[PDB]
Design a protein around this ligand. Structure first.
Ligand code: 3QR
Ligand code: ZN
Length: 258
């Protein structure tokens, strides 16, 4: 009885194995745009992805992820609300069964069709395992996806999904440039939160971009043909792998823009 997103092992059950699920800085949250506070002391984000080295793409049974070489300062995030340098480790997506759901964060209760998470870890802690134990260990860049025109920089990902259909499958995925996934603007909201999957550690500075990227209906359709199950088991489509919004409690959401 592992955790997942079904009726019997979904987000409402996770607290039994991970009691921090009911903690004080859980993610995702609804971003109320009229109560977020513009903070002029926030710096522009600095995204330096020019030397990124992607390694593999993997279906982990919960989402699919692209992993990067994080052994040096190749692809780093700095600035914004962050102190220090955060290395890119992986990206993955959360998506829905229908176009009106799929994101984890919401904006004035609006849900997007998917959400992209670029996960980075604070190099002062030496390895990612140490970083997850610290309140400033991780920085996740979140990007909303809406259905519209195709995103050409996503197509290399879509085209390899057939080869990682079921849980446990991986493939070589080199020379992918994550800059092709970013919107035009880097305006953002930020707040202190958590991982959105077990173990739900409260170690994340969230940086959620205001501007969504557009992807085509055919691109999102390919996400929805992945499988939660391993090869040989009964087919269960990988859809609706998102955690609902959690209480904000004693936290302020700050905006880099007004
Ligand atoms: O679905 C999710 N959305 S999210 O909140 O952006 C997120 C983050 C993670 N993170 C996982 C990790 C650590 O991953 C591995 O963990 C071990 C120790 O955990 C290392 O020893 C290993 O080498 C490291 O590669 N850091 N973030 C996983 C899933 C989601
Ligand atoms: Zn995620």
């Amino acid at each position: 009885h592992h955790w997942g997103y079904g009726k019997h092992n979904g987000p409402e059950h996770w607290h039994k194995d991970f009691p921090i699920a009911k903690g004080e800085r859980q993610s995702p949250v609804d971003i109320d745009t009229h109560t977020a506070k513009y903070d002029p002391s926030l710096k522009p984000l600095s995204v330096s992805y020019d030397q990124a080295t992607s390694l593999r793409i993997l279906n982990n049974g919960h989402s699919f992820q692209v992993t990067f070489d994080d052994s040096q300062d190749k692809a780093v995030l700095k600035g914004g609300p962050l102190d220090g340098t955060y290395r890119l480790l992986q990206f993955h997506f959360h998506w829905g069964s229908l176009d009106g759901q799929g994101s984890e964060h919401t904006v004035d209760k609006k849900k997007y069709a998917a959400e992209l998470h670029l996960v980075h870890w604070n190099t002062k802690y030496g390895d990612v395992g140490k970083a997850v134990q610290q309140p400033d260990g991780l920085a996740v860049l979140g990007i909303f996806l809406k259905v519209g025109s195709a995103k050409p920089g996503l197509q290399k990902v879509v085209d390899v999904l057939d080869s990682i259909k079921t849980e446990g499958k991986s493939a070589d995925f080199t020379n992918f440039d994550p800059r092709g996934l970013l919107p035009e603007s880097l305006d953002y909201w930020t707040y202190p939160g958590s991982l959105t999957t077990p173990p739900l550690a409260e170690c994340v500075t969230w940086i959620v971009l205001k501007e969504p990227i557009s992807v085509s209906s055919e691109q999102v359709l390919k996400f929805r043909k992945l499988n939660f199950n391993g090869e040989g088991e009964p087919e269960e489509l990988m859809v609706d792998n998102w955690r609902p919004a959690q209480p904000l409690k004693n936290r302020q959401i700050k905006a880099s823009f007004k």
